[PDB]
Symmetry: C2
Subunit: 38 residues, 2 copies
């Protein structure tokens, strides 16, 4: 794959951080609600 | 489809899952190793 100029743009990294934060918070949430409640 | 005339590709979603899975595993890892070690 290319470095960060060939086919990379600022409109792509936004997806990383997005799913990163929302991924942990969401995942962790369900993981706890599963059977770790209280 | 995009939010407001944008245009995505299959070479963009790879970033989401990347930081998504790697984010939870990594984050959760440090979060535990922080002071939750057993």
């Amino acid at each position: 794959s290319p470095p960060v100029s060939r086919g990379l743009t600022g409109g792509e990294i936004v997806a990383v951080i997005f799913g990163l934060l929302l991924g942990a918070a969401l995942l962790l949430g369900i993981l706890v609600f599963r059977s770790r409640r209280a």
